[PDB]
Enzyme design. Structure first.
Site, PDB file in Angstrom:
ATOM      1  N   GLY B 149      66.575  -0.177 100.662  1.00  0.00           N
ATOM      2  CA  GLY B 149      66.523  -1.603 100.403  1.00  0.00           C
ATOM      3  C   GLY B 149      67.847  -2.029  99.766  1.00  0.00           C
ATOM      4  O   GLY B 149      68.407  -3.081 100.094  1.00  0.00           O
ATOM      5  N   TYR B 155      74.778   2.484  95.284  1.00  0.00           N
ATOM      6  CA  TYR B 155      74.714   3.945  95.314  1.00  0.00           C
ATOM      7  C   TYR B 155      76.085   4.642  95.305  1.00  0.00           C
ATOM      8  O   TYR B 155      76.170   5.858  95.524  1.00  0.00           O
ATOM      9  CB  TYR B 155      73.935   4.398  96.556  1.00  0.00           C
ATOM     10  CG  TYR B 155      72.462   4.051  96.523  1.00  0.00           C
ATOM     11  CD1 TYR B 155      71.563   4.812  95.771  1.00  0.00           C
ATOM     12  CD2 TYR B 155      71.972   2.953  97.225  1.00  0.00           C
ATOM     13  CE1 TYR B 155      70.211   4.479  95.717  1.00  0.00           C
ATOM     14  CE2 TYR B 155      70.625   2.612  97.182  1.00  0.00           C
ATOM     15  CZ  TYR B 155      69.750   3.374  96.425  1.00  0.00           C
ATOM     16  OH  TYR B 155      68.423   3.009  96.356  1.00  0.00           O
ATOM     17  N   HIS B 161      72.731   2.274  90.603  1.00  0.00           N
ATOM     18  CA  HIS B 161      71.816   3.366  90.923  1.00  0.00           C
ATOM     19  C   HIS B 161      72.408   4.744  90.715  1.00  0.00           C
ATOM     20  O   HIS B 161      71.682   5.712  90.495  1.00  0.00           O
ATOM     21  CB  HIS B 161      71.284   3.240  92.358  1.00  0.00           C
ATOM     22  CG  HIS B 161      70.358   2.082  92.553  1.00  0.00           C
ATOM     23  ND1 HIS B 161      69.430   1.704  91.607  1.00  0.00           N
ATOM     24  CD2 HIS B 161      70.221   1.213  93.582  1.00  0.00           C
ATOM     25  CE1 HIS B 161      68.767   0.648  92.041  1.00  0.00           C
ATOM     26  NE2 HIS B 161      69.228   0.329  93.237  1.00  0.00           N
TER      27      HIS B 161
HETATM   28  C1  LIG Z   1      56.998   2.195  97.471  1.00  0.00           C
HETATM   29  C2  LIG Z   1      58.412   1.806  97.862  1.00  0.00           C
HETATM   30  C3  LIG Z   1      59.493   2.343  97.152  1.00  0.00           C
HETATM   31  C4  LIG Z   1      60.858   2.003  97.491  1.00  0.00           C
HETATM   32  N1  LIG Z   1      61.877   2.595  96.755  1.00  0.00           N
HETATM   33  C5  LIG Z   1      63.174   2.288  97.069  1.00  0.00           C
HETATM   34  C6  LIG Z   1      64.265   2.987  96.390  1.00  0.00           C
HETATM   35  O1  LIG Z   1      64.073   3.851  95.556  1.00  0.00           O
HETATM   36  N2  LIG Z   1      65.580   2.622  96.728  1.00  0.00           N
HETATM   37  C7  LIG Z   1      65.856   1.614  97.716  1.00  0.00           C
HETATM   38  O2  LIG Z   1      67.022   1.366  97.906  1.00  0.00           O
HETATM   39  N3  LIG Z   1      64.862   1.043  98.432  1.00  0.00           N
HETATM   40  C8  LIG Z   1      63.528   1.342  98.159  1.00  0.00           C
HETATM   41  N4  LIG Z   1      62.504   0.772  98.882  1.00  0.00           N
HETATM   42  C9  LIG Z   1      62.767  -0.181  99.996  1.00  0.00           C
HETATM   43  C10 LIG Z   1      62.746   0.548 101.368  1.00  0.00           C
HETATM   44  O3  LIG Z   1      63.762   1.546 101.370  1.00  0.00           O
HETATM   45  C11 LIG Z   1      62.968  -0.495 102.462  1.00  0.00           C
HETATM   46  O4  LIG Z   1      61.905  -1.465 102.388  1.00  0.00           O
HETATM   47  C12 LIG Z   1      62.957   0.167 103.857  1.00  0.00           C
HETATM   48  O5  LIG Z   1      64.011   1.144 103.941  1.00  0.00           O
HETATM   49  C13 LIG Z   1      63.133  -0.945 104.887  1.00  0.00           C
HETATM   50  O6  LIG Z   1      63.137  -0.360 106.334  1.00  0.00           O
HETATM   51  P1  LIG Z   1      61.913  -0.371 107.262  1.00  0.00           P
HETATM   52  O7  LIG Z   1      62.373   0.317 108.548  1.00  0.00           O
HETATM   53  O8  LIG Z   1      60.806   0.158 106.625  1.00  0.00           O
HETATM   54  O9  LIG Z   1      61.425  -1.718 107.593  1.00  0.00           O
HETATM   55  P2  LIG Z   1      61.860  -3.303 107.734  1.00  0.00           P
HETATM   56  O10 LIG Z   1      62.081  -3.925 106.388  1.00  0.00           O
HETATM   57  O11 LIG Z   1      61.052  -3.951 108.589  1.00  0.00           O
HETATM   58  O12 LIG Z   1      63.221  -3.551 108.280  1.00  0.00           O
HETATM   59  C14 LIG Z   1      63.709  -3.208 109.580  1.00  0.00           C
HETATM   60  C15 LIG Z   1      64.416  -4.551 110.018  1.00  0.00           C
HETATM   61  O13 LIG Z   1      64.922  -4.358 111.398  1.00  0.00           O
HETATM   62  C16 LIG Z   1      64.180  -5.267 112.292  1.00  0.00           C
HETATM   63  N5  LIG Z   1      63.914  -4.439 113.464  1.00  0.00           N
HETATM   64  C17 LIG Z   1      62.752  -3.759 113.771  1.00  0.00           C
HETATM   65  N6  LIG Z   1      62.827  -3.096 114.923  1.00  0.00           N
HETATM   66  C18 LIG Z   1      64.093  -3.354 115.388  1.00  0.00           C
HETATM   67  C19 LIG Z   1      64.805  -2.923 116.610  1.00  0.00           C
HETATM   68  N7  LIG Z   1      64.268  -2.145 117.529  1.00  0.00           N
HETATM   69  N8  LIG Z   1      66.110  -3.403 116.727  1.00  0.00           N
HETATM   70  C20 LIG Z   1      66.697  -4.221 115.777  1.00  0.00           C
HETATM   71  N9  LIG Z   1      66.117  -4.663 114.636  1.00  0.00           N
HETATM   72  C21 LIG Z   1      64.816  -4.203 114.487  1.00  0.00           C
HETATM   73  C22 LIG Z   1      62.972  -5.758 111.531  1.00  0.00           C
HETATM   74  O14 LIG Z   1      62.494  -6.995 111.995  1.00  0.00           O
HETATM   75  C23 LIG Z   1      63.493  -5.812 110.080  1.00  0.00           C
HETATM   76  O15 LIG Z   1      64.103  -7.011 109.685  1.00  0.00           O
HETATM   77  C24 LIG Z   1      61.094   1.082  98.587  1.00  0.00           C
HETATM   78  C25 LIG Z   1      59.992   0.536  99.316  1.00  0.00           C
HETATM   79  C26 LIG Z   1      58.666   0.875  98.983  1.00  0.00           C
HETATM   80  C27 LIG Z   1      57.563   0.255  99.810  1.00  0.00           C
HETATM   81  C1  LIG Z   2      62.012  -0.458  93.047  1.00  0.00           C
HETATM   82  C2  LIG Z   2      62.460   0.770  93.749  1.00  0.00           C
HETATM   83  C3  LIG Z   2      63.591   1.468  93.154  1.00  0.00           C
HETATM   84  N1  LIG Z   2      63.829   0.622  94.356  1.00  0.00           N
HETATM   85  C4  LIG Z   2      64.535  -0.425  94.867  1.00  0.00           C
HETATM   86  C5  LIG Z   2      65.804  -0.651  94.434  1.00  0.00           C
HETATM   87  C6  LIG Z   2      66.665  -1.746  94.993  1.00  0.00           C
HETATM   88  O1  LIG Z   2      67.799  -1.888  94.550  1.00  0.00           O
HETATM   89  C7  LIG Z   2      66.108  -2.557  96.039  1.00  0.00           C
HETATM   90  C8  LIG Z   2      64.787  -2.331  96.503  1.00  0.00           C
HETATM   91  C9  LIG Z   2      64.518  -3.266  97.535  1.00  0.00           C
HETATM   92  C10 LIG Z   2      63.177  -3.325  98.305  1.00  0.00           C
HETATM   93  O2  LIG Z   2      62.165  -3.891  97.511  1.00  0.00           O
HETATM   94  C11 LIG Z   2      65.712  -4.080  97.686  1.00  0.00           C
HETATM   95  C12 LIG Z   2      65.876  -5.247  98.729  1.00  0.00           C
HETATM   96  C13 LIG Z   2      64.833  -5.604  99.638  1.00  0.00           C
HETATM   97  C14 LIG Z   2      64.964  -6.644 100.595  1.00  0.00           C
HETATM   98  C15 LIG Z   2      66.163  -7.376 100.677  1.00  0.00           C
HETATM   99  C16 LIG Z   2      67.219  -7.055  99.793  1.00  0.00           C
HETATM  100  C17 LIG Z   2      67.069  -6.011  98.842  1.00  0.00           C
HETATM  101  N2  LIG Z   2      66.683  -3.624  96.737  1.00  0.00           N
HETATM  102  C18 LIG Z   2      68.076  -4.155  96.513  1.00  0.00           C
HETATM  103  C19 LIG Z   2      63.937  -1.303  95.976  1.00  0.00           C
HETATM  104  O3  LIG Z   2      62.784  -1.129  96.392  1.00  0.00           O
END
Ligand SMILES: Cc1cc2nc3c(=O)[nH]c(=O)nc-3n(C[C@H](O)[C@H](O)[C@H](O)COP(=O)(O)OP(=O)(O)OC[C@H]3O[C@@H](n4cnc5c(N)ncnc54)[C@H](O)[C@@H]3O)c2cc1C
Ligand SMILES: C[C@@H]1CN1C1=CC(=O)c2c(c(CO)c(-c3ccccc3)n2C)C1=O
Ligand SMILES: Cc1cc2nc3c(=O)[nH]c(=O)nc-3n(C[C@H](O)[C@H](O)[C@H](O)COP(=O)(O)OP(=O)(O)OC[C@H]3O[C@@H](n4cnc5c(N)ncnc54)[C@H](O)[C@@H]3O)c2cc1C
Ligand SMILES: C[C@@H]1CN1C1=CC(=O)c2c(c(CO)c(-c3ccccc3)n2C)C1=O
EC number: 1.6.5.2
Lengths: 273, 273
Positions: B149, B155, B161
């Site tokens: 995210g 990073y 981070h």
């Molecule tokens: C419990 C939890 C803990 C987390 N902890 C962290 C953390 O420690 N550090 C951190 O940085 N993040 C963290 N996150 C955030 C997480 O890393 C992101 O929400 C995730 O990586 C987003 O990718 P996604 O593929 O799941 O889905 P999506 O958010 O859906 O994003 C994929 C994007 O690409 C689009 N898309 C889909 N298919 C295609 C295709 N074929 N071609 C082009 N575009 C497409 C979608 O519409 C969307 O906008 C956490 C999330 C959760 C739920």
């Molecule tokens: C809380 C756990 C530790 N980690 C996260 C750390 C982030 O820095 C972060 C997240 C998300 C996803 O929630 C987005 C984010 C999501 C969507 C659009 C832009 C940033 N950012 C920047 C996380 O989930």
């Protein structure tokens, strides 16, 4: 000070040392006047997998489910699954949180990893506007009591597994401190499966001794968030002044902020830094 | 070389970028003559909790359950839960194993962590007598394809981070390399949520392009186990001779074996070291 404690245990066997360590902490703290509540993930048959079911009701966007946003909304509107809420209540009521677990694949057991993922929901456990030291749990203290199969030397700077301080970083900094927790020194009991019965009895007593004064302990050192430009613009990078100043320091600020220099010794194991 | 690939996905939505990355990888790999097998953990509704139900045979010590020992015994006698056995068969056939997952709390999702815990059983995925480079999967290669995210800068060495290399260490060295796997540079896709449609399309094309020659890549660097005296007697510590040739060196050997000195730039993200 501390008056209430939450002990999160992640072990299936009531006959394990981990359970004994959980019993020792409970007894010790209570005998010292604390109120102790438990979260025995296995006994509670805790569900560790995040899903759309964590939201008891219609989702804001079912055609493209994104757990972060959906879970936060469910939180605000009070539509989080009951089991998640009950744990969130234990966290809000707790001053001290103890995580008792056996090290598994250099991290926490999946059942606990899932507990963080479903319980540490946005808004409740954190905000991008109040990350780390400014987090919701800033008035609370957390401690990891870990047991391992591998010996302490295996985890020393010259050990084959490498520095244990690096292994603890993602958990203590990335999970606990990110949510504001003051993280205390970890209770590391190495090679528990290769330890004499009398020694184990002493490990238990040592853990109880420490808990008597656990709240008067100085916590681990993490770089303060005031050293960074906390906005999406600057990309949350260190403030340029801090960078320049830091350029004349022999050691990096911590394991994660080593900056390419020497990592403060036992930054994630020993306090005072 | 390698004709057999396994892709382990840890994401519940077919609409996610993670799923998109999985399809792209399979489509590209099949195009170059690879056989592609999948382990979509959520679709399989995979059980991520290690318990005595992972063993179908009669335990050696039912009153004092110890997973390490009992599971190893079950593997040796063929008493492991059939779902675990099915995954182990996929691993044995694979030459290349791809782990596609969104970073969650600075680590792999709980469902994926549970997969490692229940599937990477002793003897099968590792042996203390032949740890790391000498492990069971030394003829195989593994790669982590992660989406986050947070932005890349968060990073970087000076991002709030902390260094991504530290976060990667416990998974790539502790889980993957410990079992013998040659670990290739991780495919890191930052702030996927904040990436323009045209850019996402390019991220997919770039991943397909990389896979066209993935098998010929130089893997990441981990100190060879030969630098250590691999016995409970020497405390699995680095050989005194090796320790002497390093006291003069500026940089440590890797993230875990930083030795109190500087960590080699991007030790866990870029090869050549
Ligand atoms: C419990 C939890 C803990 C987390 N902890 C962290 C953390 O420690 N550090 C951190 O940085 N993040 C963290 N996150 C955030 C997480 O890393 C992101 O929400 C995730 O990586 C987003 O990718 P996604 O593929 O799941 O889905 P999506 O958010 O859906 O994003 C994929 C994007 O690409 C689009 N898309 C889909 N298919 C295609 C295709 N074929 N071609 C082009 N575009 C497409 C979608 O519409 C969307 O906008 C956490 C999330 C959760 C739920
Ligand atoms: C809380 C756990 C530790 N980690 C996260 C750390 C982030 O820095 C972060 C997240 C998300 C996803 O929630 C987005 C984010 C999501 C969507 C659009 C832009 C940033 N950012 C920047 C996380 O989930
Ligand atoms: C999936 C998996 C992954 C693992 N990954 C790692 C890893 O990455 N690194 C690593 O180092 N290790 C690893 N391990 C090993 C694990 O950390 C140890 O097996 C565990 O910490 C041992 O402690 P225990 O309390 O669980 O249980 P037990 O093995 O039962 O040991 C506790 C010991 O204390 C005795 N005991 C029990 N109760 C009491 C009491 N009240 N008073 C006195 N003595 C008592 C018991 O009889 C026993 O001998 C892994 C294990 C598994 C299953
Ligand atoms: C990192 C990967 C997961 N695993 C382990 C690594 C070890 O170095 C180890 C283990 C055990 C437990 O099986 C013991 C051990 C157990 C009992 C007595 C002495 C050592 N040791 C030294 C592990 O499980």
């Amino acid at each position: 000070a501390g008056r209430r404690a939450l002990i999160v245990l992640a072990h299936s066997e009531r006959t394990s040392f981990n359970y004994a360590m959980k019993e020792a902490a409970a007894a010790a703290l209570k005998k010292k006047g604390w109120e102790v509540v438990e979260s025995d993930l296995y006994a509670m048959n805790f569900n560790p997998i995040i899903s759309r079911k964590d939201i008891t009701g219609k989702l804001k966007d079912p055609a493209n489910f994104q757990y972060p946003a959906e879970s936060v909304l469910a939180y605000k509107e009070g539509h989080l699954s009951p089991d998640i809420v009950a744990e969130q209540k234990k966290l809000e009521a707790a001053d001290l949180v103890i995580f008792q677990f056996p090290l598994q694949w250099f991290g926490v057991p999946a059942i606990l990893k899932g507990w963080f993922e479903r319980v540490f929901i946005g808004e409740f456990a954190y905000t991008y506007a109040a990350m780390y030291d400014k987090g919701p749990f800033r008035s609370k203290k957390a401690v990891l009591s870990i047991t391992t199969g591998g010996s302490g030397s295996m985890y020393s700077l010259q050990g084959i597994h490498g520095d244990m301080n690096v292994i603890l970083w993602p958990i203590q900094s990335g999970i606990l401190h990110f949510c504001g927790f003051q993280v205390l020194e970890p209770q590391l009991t190495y090679s528990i499966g290769h330890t004499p019965a009398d020694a184990r009895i002493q490990i238990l007593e040592g853990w109880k001794k420490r808990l008597e004064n656990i709240w008067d302990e100085t916590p681990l050192y993490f770089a303060p968030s005031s050293l960074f430009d906390l906005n999406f613009q600057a990309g949350f990078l260190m403030k340029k002044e801090v960078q320049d100043e830091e350029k004349n320091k022999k050691f990096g600020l911590s394991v994660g902020h080593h900056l390419g220099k020497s990592i403060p010794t036992d930054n994630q194991i020993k306090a005072r830094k």
